[PDB]
Amino acid sequence: WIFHALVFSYISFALISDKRYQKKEPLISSVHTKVKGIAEVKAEILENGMKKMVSGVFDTADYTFPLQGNSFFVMTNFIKTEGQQQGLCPDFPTARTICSSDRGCKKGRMDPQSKGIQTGRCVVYKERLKTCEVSAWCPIEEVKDAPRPALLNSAENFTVLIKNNIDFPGHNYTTRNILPGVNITCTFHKTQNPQCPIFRLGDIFQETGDSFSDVAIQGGIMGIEIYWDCNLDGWFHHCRPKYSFRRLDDKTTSESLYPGYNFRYAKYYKENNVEKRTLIKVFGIRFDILVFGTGGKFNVIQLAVYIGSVISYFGLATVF
Amino acid sequence: WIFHALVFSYISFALISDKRYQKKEPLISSVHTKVKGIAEVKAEILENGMKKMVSGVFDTADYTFPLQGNSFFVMTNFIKTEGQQQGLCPDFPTARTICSSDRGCKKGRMDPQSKGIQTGRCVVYKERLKTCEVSAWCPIEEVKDAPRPALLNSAENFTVLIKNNIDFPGHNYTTRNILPGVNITCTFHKTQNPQCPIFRLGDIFQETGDSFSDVAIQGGIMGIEIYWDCNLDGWFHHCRPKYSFRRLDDKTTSESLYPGYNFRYAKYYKENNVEKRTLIKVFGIRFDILVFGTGGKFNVIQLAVYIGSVISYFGLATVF
Amino acid sequence: WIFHALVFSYISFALISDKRYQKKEPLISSVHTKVKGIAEVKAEILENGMKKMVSGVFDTADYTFPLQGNSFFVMTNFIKTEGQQQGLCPDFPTARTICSSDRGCKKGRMDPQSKGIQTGRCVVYKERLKTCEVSAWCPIEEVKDAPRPALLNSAENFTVLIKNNIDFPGHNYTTRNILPGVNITCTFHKTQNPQCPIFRLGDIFQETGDSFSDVAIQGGIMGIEIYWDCNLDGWFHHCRPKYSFRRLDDKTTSESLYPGYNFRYAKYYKENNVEKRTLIKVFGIRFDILVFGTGGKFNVIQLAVYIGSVISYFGLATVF
Ligand SMILES: Cc1nc(/N=N/c2ccc(S(=O)(=O)O)cc2S(=O)(=O)O)c(COP(=O)(O)O)c(C=O)c1O
Ligand SMILES: Cc1nc(/N=N/c2ccc(S(=O)(=O)O)cc2S(=O)(=O)O)c(COP(=O)(O)O)c(C=O)c1O
Ligand SMILES: Cc1nc(/N=N/c2ccc(S(=O)(=O)O)cc2S(=O)(=O)O)c(COP(=O)(O)O)c(C=O)c1O
Ligand SMILES: *[C@@H]1O[C@H](CO)[C@@H](O)[C@H](O)[C@H]1NC(C)=O
Ligand SMILES: *[C@@H]1O[C@H](CO)[C@@H](O)[C@H](O)[C@H]1NC(C)=O
Ligand SMILES: *[C@@H]1O[C@H](CO)[C@@H](O)[C@H](O)[C@H]1NC(C)=O
Ligand SMILES: *[C@@H]1O[C@H](CO)[C@@H](O)[C@H](O)[C@H]1NC(C)=O
Ligand SMILES: *[C@@H]1O[C@H](CO)[C@@H](O)[C@H](O)[C@H]1NC(C)=O
Ligand SMILES: *[C@@H]1O[C@H](CO)[C@@H](O)[C@H](O)[C@H]1NC(C)=O
């Protein structure tokens, strides 16, 4: 007779735990993101072998781009090349582009570590460096590593504000991330104020256990995930989010693979009645907002189905 | 003996309504958007205490940007600052940057309502207004409210074409939003033609009940939902969408929070061998295409499971 | 007594195949995309009835834009109009814009194939063709078909690298598309190596049976699906992706509809203290990364529910 109560207790435990009498609806969301703060750059680099001091300020129209869906990118490090005009000129001398005669590199080929098509004229580049000229935007941007001190090293002091509006299409529920009547001056913390939406780059990077400098030398991918477990029944009703953060990049730095996150941005202009462009190689962290969750509500068909299943189970148990 | 038929009737009702004999699969969709129409601007603004006239025309290359996934932005209002050179210059005098001596604002402190780093030497700015100069782009963008008449109030007179292509990966089904051989010169209405994809901005703004000449001042977020409910079984086969619109913005107008939807655009150029740039503070309505739906197909395993469940239920009912 | 074993065999088959004893969790993903390769353009065009030669080379900062979520765009063909000043000038003479008197077209009427607002002055434009001038950017970009040979016809030779990081928030599982210690230099193939993420545009276009040149005239929408079927149980544990491709565009080429994928890009500048802009109509294939999948783990409550259901089923079968 002990098993008769045991199966009843187990069914009650299952029903209380998994909420099998609850119909679950998916999430439909919309994310708004605002990045504040300004940065100050002051350092020196070696452009083409010549020392050059780069100093100035960056406001919220420089280190960012208009949001693409639910994500946002932040400038961290950049390599600048200016005064590029289209024409024939020798490339940066590497192992694969070096030559001693026109026989080595032939016209029409396209190496995967070079831009343009070479013509097969192995001429001296600089200080008796024989490379064959390529058709591209002169001067070709010499491939160099990112500076050891991060240019946008103050990016850990920036602030971000995230507004989330989730919907449940099965039911008549749409809710927001910010309840009306709460303070706006705050800083997120796992213990002090979980509900605080304002994050800080230093804090989110420290939570994952990675230092900002190493992750920012070449950039990476970061992810803020928001879990929405909401009970829409009349009793014990709550719809509140939980925030966590994870590194979305493999963090391997393989030579064959492509470490971090980077791209090239080209700005065009016309001067002296000829077109020209400036190229910035950009390494920065891209933050992805991953919002997910479920919404539960009371339904009778699923409850009846589960009741029938557990009735069959306990009847079979009572049979033997 | 009435219950012995009541249970069967309720089981049949549940099977017919909830479609428990139908395996369900989620949605994989794709959105293609094209916005047309032109806008004419003719108004007067007050910049730096001087009255200026802004007149001209914007076409589809102006008031929008290339689509970012399933979303599109429309320019509605802008504040322009032209001719910024980078250096030390006084900022806009607020209630926190004023001074009576250099000691009011320290050197190196980063204020949350100022772009640049003040140096700690506060001098007059205009009409004997003492502020401490910051190292930023000059002249500093004048903090002012958006003009009371919308510079692009004709934005409500626009048309947008949306093509949706959804898939059901579990089954073999990929369908579109528009069928072949139908008219393409129409206007969406809830009763006249639900299948019309061309959405007039005035129509979508009036369906929700919010006047266009109010949210256009600071922008906003709107969500267009294309709900799909397709029965992929051979019998009673139909797969058609239903369009709905909602306001995805809080619309609380909180001073502490950031109402509307605004961002800063920066355009760089070079004049007299000096790198300058132009700022445009942009307010506009960002439209989101929220697409969701579940595809249903007849399956034997779920039918058998539900049959067993109702067998248990009505057997228990017959027992007592 | 044969049915007694038959129902048990059917239940076992259903459990083994449909994996009803397995709890399924949805997918939370992130996509990183890198596009390599360079293009060379050398052709002749007819602008304003005059022959011109377009020659140059485009690198990875020209034929693309920064990634917008899980998608990326590639330039394929462009029509350029340089040096536009904003003022009153005649438009392109078409059927709906031609006139013989000022009364044919009235001021303030916005036709739906036009950029600008006419003032009602039917003046000569070229070869004694009378049209009423509109207020817009001049010269107005003449409407013409794209050149028959694609300008970026070499775009089919480009390579794209895709990195996928999928998550299962229900469980403790976050995995990646590329495993560590695997060769990077490779080309994707269904039989040779289906795990290589490096996709070739020519290869993917040929896989779907559509020639690259034909769809490159007006562009299109491409869809790459990554399907994940991962079993998280300790036994028979495997979680690897499968790659599929299809065309996301209707490919109807209806005159009323809008064939292909295209958009207008405007680049602003200042010359002689006058603001001018350059317009580029762009046709190109937009690639979408549709990633989806499910994660299966071992759970006891679903197993018990299905066990009870089959208990009722075979008990009813044995009853009659
Ligand atoms: C040292 C270094 N190396 C870079 N790339 N190295 C590649 C890239 C591709 C291939 S492969 O032929 O496809 O296998 C092989 C190599 S390898 O030299 O490491 O062997 C880049 C990125 O430059 P790009 O954006 O122009 O690609 C940067 C940027 O800063 C860099 O500092
Ligand atoms: C009146 C007005 N006010 C604005 N912002 N007001 C803020 C912003 C932040 C903070 S806080 O310190 O973070 O708490 C407090 C305030 S408060 O003055 O309302 O108290 C902006 C936006 O300007 P930004 O884009 O530069 O932020 C505009 C734009 O038009 C505006 O017209
Ligand atoms: C031949 C041709 N035709 C184009 N458009 N044709 C339209 C567009 C709209 C309407 S409708 O009034 O809305 O029904 C009717 C027509 S129709 O002439 O085919 O009947 C475009 C695109 O030009 P836009 O981007 O300026 O729209 C291009 C671009 O190359 C083109 O080559
Ligand atoms: C961030 O700001 C605080 C404010 O006092 C300052 O102490 C700290 O040095 C700053 N960190 C960086 C990296 O600039
Ligand atoms: C907000 O913070 C201030 C000081 O930081 C405090 O005085 C106030 O009680 C808080 N709550 C509200 C609702 O203002
Ligand atoms: C929109 O266009 C119609 C077309 O005639 C016109 O009557 C109406 O006044 C316009 N409204 C606005 C706000 O431009
Ligand atoms: C489309 O609309 C036109 C007039 O707007 C009408 O004459 C025609 O019958 C409609 N249907 C088709 C298939 O053209
Ligand atoms: C693609 O590159 C290969 C490399 O040899 C070349 O043979 C082929 O002609 C190229 N195709 C196009 C369309 O440029
Ligand atoms: C990778 O490819 C190279 C040649 O393409 C081959 O020699 C090597 O064995 C492969 N595997 C590894 C792990 O390098």
Author numbering:
A (entry chain C), B (entry chain B), C (entry chain A): 31 to 350
Give the article text.
The structures of pdP2X7 in the presence of PPNDS and PPADS were determined at 3.3 Å and 3.6 Å, respectively. In the PPNDS-bound and PPADS-bound structures, PPNDS and PPADS molecules bind to essentially the same orthosteric site, consistent with both PPNDS and PPADS being pyridoxal phosphate derivatives. It should be noted that while the pyridoxal phosphate groups in PPNDS and PPADS are shared, the naphthylazo group of PPNDS is significantly bulkier than the azophenyl group of PPADS. In both structures, the pyridoxal phosphate group has extensive interactions with the receptor. The phosphate group of PPNDS and PPADS interacts directly with the side chain of Arg294 and possibly also with Lys145, possibly via a water molecule. Furthermore, in the PPADS-bound structure, Lys64 mediates an additional interaction with the phosphate group. Interestingly, despite the structural differences between PPNDS and PPADS, the two common sulfonic acid groups form hydrogen bonds with the side chains of the same residues in the receptor, Lys66 and Gln143. In contrast, both PPNDS and PPADS possess only one phosphate group, so there was no corresponding downward movement in the left flipper domain. The binding of these competitive inhibitors may prevent the downward movement of the left flipper domain, which is required for channel opening. Consistent with antagonist binding, the TM domain adapts to the closed conformation of the channel, as similarly observed in the previously reported closed state structures of P2X7 receptors.
